């Protein structure tokens, strides 16, 4: 159950990625094989549907299977098509944890602050390296969840009954922008610094998200890898807190925070330069792929 | 030129106000006077549309000759944040008033929006420490990056007043503002949008904040250390800013946390904060 925003010959669709050379395009699958039209024009419109959307996703992916000869009209192989960012635009600021794996500090509270939906960005998209402004940016591997079912005061007991899925972010930053304006927001928040995808997992594919694992690689060089039973604090127990006074809408994303490894960790550090190539990898989300510009 | 969100009959509509016991429903006005109907639903997308809405909104309002209808008195109107749901986070100016020597800048979550008259939720389980900020906010109305201080003042629609309320704990405990800043309810916005063309010198406003009528605070824009100009320029050196996007240009002192004793929002309380001439924007603490 991999859910996706494509662009192909100029048009923007809600994706199914079947086996990972294939996506459908739901709007005109539906539209063949049940002669319906339900399915919204993007993935957050989907996602606050919740399982119905995703049950209504699977039967249209098993009634695909069953032989017919319009295949070609709305299953497309992904070497064609492009992935954008699987939420291109969300409708606030993405919530990032700060400090969350125990190496990577070197926090009783969870440190949250926010990035623009103007960061956002897709698999494959260059990043703009924004030599003016900074010599510092770096990388961040993070896995990412996206709130499929609005609440407030949410108990950890209950909390991955609002979550949707899962998928990857790069939350890049530039480290002096950081220190100079105190708040993260400005440092956080450059245009392109945060791909996001390559697709969003639903949960129900996903049982066991404390043994995913994320995997970063600068230039083909293994930088970060940490495991999410290793945060400091869990998934449930951030949506706890940041929902204690605030309400978590269906499409909001968390970056859960990033391992160790980052290239200010270094010693000469290692900030991103033009051409270097950025993959996070976490299974069975699959792999972030950018360059910056 | 003020533009307003109104709801009436249980319909939300992109509102002018003329003398300012009256409001025009937009959208109502340009299909009696000119049966066209291209007046989009939401203010924010008015913004985008730029000067050619406002003009448009000019016209509709000097073709009153004769109501119903389309033009409603403020009476029997609710009005919402002018904005009722921002496209991203408010941004938010920290200490501008008084030394920084580069602004601190954070945001308060959509969620937080709410209007003139709304009740502010006083969040007793989260904190007890819920302190009033009263605010000069800018409003883009045209996109930009890398805008120079020089031609800042072209990219900015208007101003309205903000209540940036805060949980001063939480802030503590978190470190960065984002989730003490970003408890539901906690921006009032309003009463109204002022477009620019009203203002025009907006170094001479001055923000006035009154708790149970007691004046608490009384800033002029003229001394923020930060303009306006100069944080378009910072905030847009890497960045974006669309049109609809809102900063909070910092609070002059008086807050609660300032006294000894400090005085913290409880049940009950009034905060009126003033700003010329876009008006009052007046809120109450909720029950437990
Ligand atoms: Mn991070
Ligand atoms: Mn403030």
New interface residues.
């Given amino acids: 159950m991999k859910f996706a925003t494509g662009e192909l010959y100029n048009r923007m669709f809600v994706g199914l990625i079947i086996d990972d050379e294939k996506i459908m395009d739901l709007q005109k699958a539906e539209k063949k094989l049940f002669e319906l039209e339900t399915i919204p024009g993007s993935l957050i419109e989907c996602i606050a549907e919740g399982d119905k959307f995703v049950a209504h996703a699977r039967q249209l992916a098993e009634w695909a299977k069953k032989p017919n000869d319009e295949l070609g009209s709305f299953m497309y192989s992904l070497s064609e098509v492009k992935l954008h960012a699987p939420i291109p635009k969300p409708?606030?600021?993405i919530?990032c944890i700060?400090k969350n794996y125990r190496d990577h500090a070197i926090p009783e509270?969870?440190?949250?602050?926010?990035k623009?939906?103007?960061t956002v960005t897709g698999h494959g998209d260059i990043v703009?390296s924004?030599e003016?402004?900074?010599s510092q940016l770096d990388y961040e591997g993070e896995l990412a969840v996206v709130i499929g079912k609005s609440g407030?005061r949410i108990s950890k007991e209950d909390a991955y009954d609002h979550v949707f899925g899962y998928t990857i972010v790069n939350d890049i930053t530039?480290r002096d922008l950081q220190k100079?304006?105190?708040?993260?927001?400005?440092g956080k928040?450059?245009?392109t610094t945060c791909p996001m995808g390559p697709v969003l997992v639903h949960k129900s594919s996903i049982q066991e998200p404390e043994r995913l694992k994320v995997e970063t690689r600068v230039n083909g060089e293994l930088r970060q890898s940490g495991s999410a039973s290793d945060m400091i604090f869990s998934i449930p127990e951030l949506i706890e807190?940041?929902s204690?006074?605030?309400?978590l809408?269906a499409g909001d994303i968390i970056a859960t925070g990033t391992p160790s490894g980052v290239g200010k960790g270094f010693t000469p550090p290692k900030f991103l330069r033009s051409g270097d190539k950025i993959d996070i990898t976490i299974d069975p989300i699959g792999t972030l792929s950018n360059q910056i510009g």
């Fill in positions: 409708s606030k600021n919530i700060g509270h969870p440190m949250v602050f926010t623009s939906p103007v703009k924004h003016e402004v900074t407030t530039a100079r304006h105190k708040q993260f927001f400005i928040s450059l245009d807190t940041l204690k006074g605030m309400t809408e």
